[PDB]
C-alpha cells in the first residue's frame, strides 16, 4: 500500500485532499469551501501577529490599533488584510450558502452537513462582532452596546445577563478586555466545527450541479480539484489585494476612525455591511422583544429548508419556477441590506417589512408550494394516461 | 447498529472512550493520560477566564495579575488553579513519561506515539515559560532574558534572532505583549498534538504491565476504565485543592511577587522547579554553546530509546538489572533538580557534571549494554547447550 494511504496521519490528508472521489461535473461554485478555509487561515494568522502589538485596555485599544497602523513594519497590511479579509470571508460565505439553497445541498443525506454550517455561520458572525469591538472606535462602542443589549429582551433575567456580559454599568474596560479574549477563542472553535463540517461532508461526498448521483463517474481530488481550487485562490487573492492596497477603507465606516465616546452615538451610525440584512429585519418590527426574536429566527429558519422542500429532485437546475423564486430571494436579501443602510423613514419602513415577510415566506410558503406544483408539472407533462 | 456506532460524531466518541478494547490488566500508571487531558482543560479554561482581566503591557502586566488576585470574584482561585495547575501538569507528565520508560511504551510499534509525545513535552515547556513571563515579576523578566538569549548561541544569526524575539533592545513591552499572544496560541497547538497522540495510540491500543500482547483479553473502556479514571480524577483534584486553598505558593518563588526590574537580577534567582534538571545540565558545561546544546539534547535523547533498547521483551517487569538502573535514572533526575536549586559551588558542580553524564549514559550506554546482557541471561538460564 502506498505510504500516503498506510501512514496514520497522511491517510487523512489522502482521503480528504488526494484520493477523495469528486463528482466529475462540479463547477466553480464548489470552490467556495476551500476559499472559506483560506479565509479562516488568513484571519487567524493576521490576527495572531497583530495580537502581538495590541492592548485590550479601553484606554489603549484604539491607539494600539493606530500603533499597528503606523509603527509596526507592514502593520497596515496586517490590519487591512484582517479587516477586508473579514468582509471577503462573509461575501464568500454568502455565496457558499446561496450555492447550497440553489443546488439543494441542504437535503438528505446532507442535513447534518447543513446544520453544522448554520452553526458555523452564527459563530463567525459573533467572532466578527467581537473583533469589531476591539478597535474601540465610535462604531465599536455602540455596536457593543446594542448587541449586548439584544439580550435584555430575555424576560426576568434579561438585564442581569447584560450586566454580566458588560461586567459593569455599561460597555467599559471589562467588556473590551473580555471581548478581545473571546475574539481570540471563537476562531479556534470555528476551526473545530469546520472539521465536524468536513467529517459530515466526507461520508456522503459532495453533490453536483445535476442534483443526481455522482457514483458512476468520479475523478480524484488531486491535480484536478487541487489545481482548479488554485484558480479561485489566486482570483480571491487578486481581488482582496486590490482592496487592501488601493481601497482599504471602502468596505468600512469613517466613524470607526473616531475613539469610542460613551456619551455620543453618532447620527451616522450604521452596522457593518454584512449584518445589514439582519439589522433591517429587526427594525421592521415595532416591538423590542419581537424584533430580536424575528432577527434570530431569520438565521434559524435556514434549518427548516430540508423539510419545506417537498420536491422529488435535488437542486434548481431543471426547475423554472424554483430558479425564478430563488433569485427573488437573493435580490430581496440584497434589498434588505440596502434598506438597512437607510434611515427609518416612510417608504423604507414599509419596504423593509414586506421584504422581511418575503424573506420568511420563501422558506415557509414559497418553496413548499412551488416544489409541490413542480412535482405535479413534471408528472402530467409527459405521463399519458 | 447502535446510534453511538452509526453516527458520524458519536462513533468517534465510541471508538476512543466507550467500546475501545483495553488490556484487562493495565494498572493505575495508565491513568496518567486521562489526567493530562484534565490538566490541559483546567489550564485552558482558567487561562481564558483570567485573560478577560489581564493586560499584557509591561507596565500593567504585574498589577493586572494583582487585580485578578484582589478585585476579581474568585480571581485568586483562578490564578492559584492556573499556577498550581501548571506544576501538577508537569508532575503528571513526568510520571506519564516515566511510565513509558519503565514499560517500554516507546518500543515498536509505538515509536510515533512516543515521538509525538516528545513534541508535546517541548510545546508544554515553552507554553509554561511564556505563561510565567506574563506575570512580569523579577523571575519573569530574567527568565525571559535568559531563555530568549539561549538562541544567541546560534552562530552568526544568533543575536538577530534574539533581537527579533525581543522586538527591541531588551525584554520590554513588545516582548511581553507577544509572549502573552503566544501563550494563548500554543495550548491550542498542544491540543492538536494531543489528538495526533491519541490517533497513534488508537491504531495500536495501549500496552500493558506484562509487556506482551493484550489481544487475548480486552475489556471495554466504558464502565471499567471510565470509572477507574474517575478515581484518579478525584485524587488529583483533592491534592490540587490542598495546594490551591491551603498552600498556594509553596511551589513558586517569592521573587515573582516583586515587579520585574531591568537593572537588577536578584541574587536569589532560581528557575521554576520543573525546569531545574535541565537547568542543572546546562550549568554543568563551562561553555556557552556546548551548554545550550547539551541541555536541548537532554530532551531530544528521549528519541533514541527505541533504538538503544536491545531487549527482546518489552518493559522492565521481569528484568532485575533494568529495574535497578531505571531507579538510578529516576533518582539521578531528582538529584539533578536539587543541584539546580543550589549555587554554583564546589561539591555541587562536580556532582552535577557527574549526574549529567549519568543522565546521557543511561540512554546511550547503560540501556543498550544491560539489555544485551539480560537477553543472554534469559537464554543461558534455561537452554541446555
Amino acid at each position: 500500500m502506498a505510504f500516503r494511504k498506510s501512514n496514520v496521519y497522511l491517510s487523512l490528508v489522502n482521503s480528504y485532499i488526494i484520493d477523495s472521489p469528486q463528482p466529475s461535473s462540479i463547477n466553480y461554485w464548489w470552490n467556495m469551501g476551500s476559499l472559506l478555509g483560506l479565509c479562516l487561515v488568513i484571519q487567524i494568522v493576521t490576527g495572531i501577529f497583530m495580537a502581538m502589538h495590541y492592548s485590550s485596555n479601553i484606554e489603549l485599544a484604539f491607539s494600539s490599533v493606530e500603533h499597528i497602523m503606523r509603527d509596526v513594519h507592514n502593520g497596515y497590511i496586517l490590519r487591512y488584510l484582517h479587516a477586508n479579509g473579514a468582509s471577503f470571508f462573509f461575501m464568500v460565505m454568502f455565496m457558499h450558502m446561496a450555492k447550497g439553497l440553489y443546488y439543494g445541498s441542504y437535503r438528505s443525506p446532507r442535513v447534518t452537513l447543513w446544520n453544522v454550517g448554520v452553526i458555523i455561520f452564527i459563530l463567525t458572525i459573533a467572532t466578527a462582532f467581537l473583533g469589531y469591538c476591539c478597535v474601540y472606535g465610535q462604531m465599536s462602542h455602540w455596536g457593543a452596546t446594542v448587541i449586548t443589549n439584544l439580550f435584555s429582551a430575555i424576560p426576568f433575567v434579561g438585564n442581569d445577563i447584560v450586566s454580566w456580559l458588560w461586567g459593569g454599568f455599561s460597555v467599559s474596560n471589562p467588556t473590551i478586555q473580555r471581548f478581545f479574549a473571546l475574539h481570540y477563542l471563537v476562531p479556534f472553535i470555528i476551526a473545530a466545527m469546520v472539521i465536524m463540517h468536513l467529517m459530515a461532508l466526507h461520508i456522503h461526498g459532495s453533490s453536483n450541479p445535476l442534483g443526481i448521483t455522482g457514483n458512476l463517474d468520479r475523478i480524484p481530488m488531486h491535480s484536478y480539484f487541487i489545481f482548479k481550487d488554485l484558480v479561485t485562490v489566486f482570483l480571491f487573492m487578486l481581488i482582496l489585494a486590490l482592496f487592501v492596497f488601493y481601497s482599504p477603507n471602502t468596505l468600512g465606516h469613517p466613524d470607526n476612525y473616531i475613539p469610542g465616546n460613551p456619551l455620543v452615538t453618532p447620527a451616522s451610525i450604521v452596522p457593518e455591511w454584512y449584518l445589514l440584512p439582519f439589522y433591517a429585519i429587526l427594525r421592521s418590527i415595532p416591538d423590542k422583544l419581537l424584533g430580536v426574536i424575528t432577527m434570530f429566527a431569520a438565521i434559524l429558519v435556514l434549518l427548516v429548508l430540508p423539510f419545506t422542500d417537498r420536491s422529488v429532485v435535488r437542486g434548481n437546475t431543471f426547475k423554472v419556477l424554483s430558479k425564478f423564486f430563488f433569485f427573488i430571494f437573493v435580490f430581496n436579501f440584497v434589498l434588505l441590506g440596502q434598506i438597512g443602510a437607510c434611515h427609518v423613514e416612510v417608504p423604507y419602513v414599509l419596504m423593509g417589512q414586506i421584504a422581511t415577510f418575503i424573506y420568511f415566506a420563501y422558506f415557509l410558503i414559497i418553496v413548499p408550494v412551488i416544489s409541490t406544483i413542480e412535482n405535479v408539472l413534471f408528472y402530467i407533462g409527459r405521463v399519458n394516461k | 447498529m447502535a446510534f453511538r456506532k452509526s453516527n458520524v460524531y458519536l462513533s468517534l466518541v465510541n471508538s476512543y472512550i466507550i467500546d475501545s478494547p483495553q488490556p484487562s490488566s493495565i494498572n493505575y500508571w495508565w491513568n496518567m493520560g486521562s489526567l493530562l487531558g484534565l490538566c490541559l482543560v483546567i489550564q485552558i479554561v482558567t487561562g481564558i477566564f483570567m485573560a478577560m482581566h489581564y493586560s499584557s503591557n509591561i507596565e500593567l502586566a504585574f498589577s493586572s495579575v494583582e487585580h485578578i488576585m484582589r478585585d476579581v470574584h474568585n480571581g485568586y482561585i483562578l490564578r492559584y488553579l492556573h499556577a498550581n495547575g501548571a506544576s501538577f501538569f508537569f508532575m503528571v507528565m513526568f510520571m506519564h513519561m516515566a511510565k513509558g520508560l519503565y514499560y517500554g511504551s516507546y518500543r515498536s510499534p509505538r515509536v510515533t506515539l512516543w515521538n509525538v509525545g516528545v513534541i508535546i513535552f517541548i510545546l508544554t515547556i515553552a507554553t509554561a515559560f511564556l505563561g510565567y513571563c506574563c506575570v512580569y515579576g523579577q523571575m519573569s523578566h530574567w527568565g525571559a532574558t535568559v531563555i530568549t538569549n539561549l538562541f544567541s548561541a546560534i552562530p552568526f544569526v544568533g543575536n538577530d534572532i534574539v533581537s527579533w524575539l525581543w522586538g527591541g533592545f531588551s525584554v520590554s513591552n513588545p516582548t511581553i505583549q507577544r509572549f502573552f499572544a503566544l501563550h494563548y496560541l500554543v495550548p491550542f497547538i498542544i491540543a492538536a498534538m494531543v489528538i495526533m497522540h491519541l490517533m497513534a495510540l488508537h491504531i495500536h491500543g495501549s500496552s500493558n504491565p506484562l509487556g506482551i500482547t493484550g489481544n487475548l483479553d480486552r475489556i471495554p473502556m466504558h464502565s471499567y476504565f471510565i470509572f477507574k479514571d474517575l478515581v484518579t480524577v478525584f485524587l488529583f483534584m483533592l491534592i490540587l485543592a490542598l495546594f490551591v486553598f491551603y498552600s498556594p505558593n509553596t511551589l513558586g518563588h517569592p521573587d515573582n511577587y516583586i515587579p520585574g526590574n531591568p537593572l537588577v537580577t536578584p541574587a536569589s534567582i532560581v528557575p521554576e522547579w520543573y525546569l531545574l534538571p535541565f537547568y542543572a545540565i546546562l550549568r554543568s558545561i563551562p561553555d556557552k554553546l556546548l551548554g545550550v546544546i547539551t541541555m536541548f539534547a537532554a530532551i531530544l535523547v528521549l528519541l533514541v530509546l527505541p533504538f538503544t533498547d536491545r531487549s527482546v521483551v518489552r518493559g522492565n517487569t521481569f528484568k532485575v538489572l533494568s529495574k535497578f538502573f531505571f531507579f538510578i535514572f529516576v533518582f539521578n533526575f531528582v538529584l539533578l533538580g536539587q543541584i539546580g536549586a543550589c549555587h554554583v559551588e564546589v561539591p555541587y558542580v562536580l556532582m552535577g557534571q557527574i549526574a549529567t553524564f549519568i543522565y546521557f549514559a543511561y540512554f546511550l550506554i547503560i540501556v543498550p549494554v544491560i539489555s544485551t546482557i539480560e537477553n543472554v541471561l534469559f537464554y543461558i538460564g534455561r537452554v541446555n547447550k
Partner: protein, 125 residues
Amino acid sequence: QSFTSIARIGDYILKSPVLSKLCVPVANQFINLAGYKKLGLKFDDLIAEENPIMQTALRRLPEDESYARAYRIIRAHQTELTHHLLPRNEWIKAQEDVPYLLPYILEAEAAAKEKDELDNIEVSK
C-alpha cells in the same frame, strides 16, 4: 537484538566450562528473581510479538502448543490484574520453562537473513 545473535553468544558461553560455571548460576538467579514463572508464564511467552519474525514463528507453532500459550497469557493478565501470584503448584517449573518457540524464531530469522543477502548480492563478471 536477534535471537541468532543471542544464541551465538549464549552457546559459546554454555560450551565453555569456565564461563559456564561462572555465568549460568547468575542467570538461574536472574530468572528466579524475574518472577515470570510465578505468573505461570514460560520465558518464550514474554517475547514481544509485534514484528514479522515473531508473527511467522507464531503462525508455524503447532495448534496444541498455541492453545497452551494462549491460556498462560490469559491466566497471567488475570492474575496480574488481581495483584496476586498463582499458587505455587501452578508455577512453571524450571523443567517446564522450555524454549518451545525459539527453534521457530531461529528458522524464520535465517530465512529472512538469506533473503536479505540474496536481495543485495553483487555480481563478479
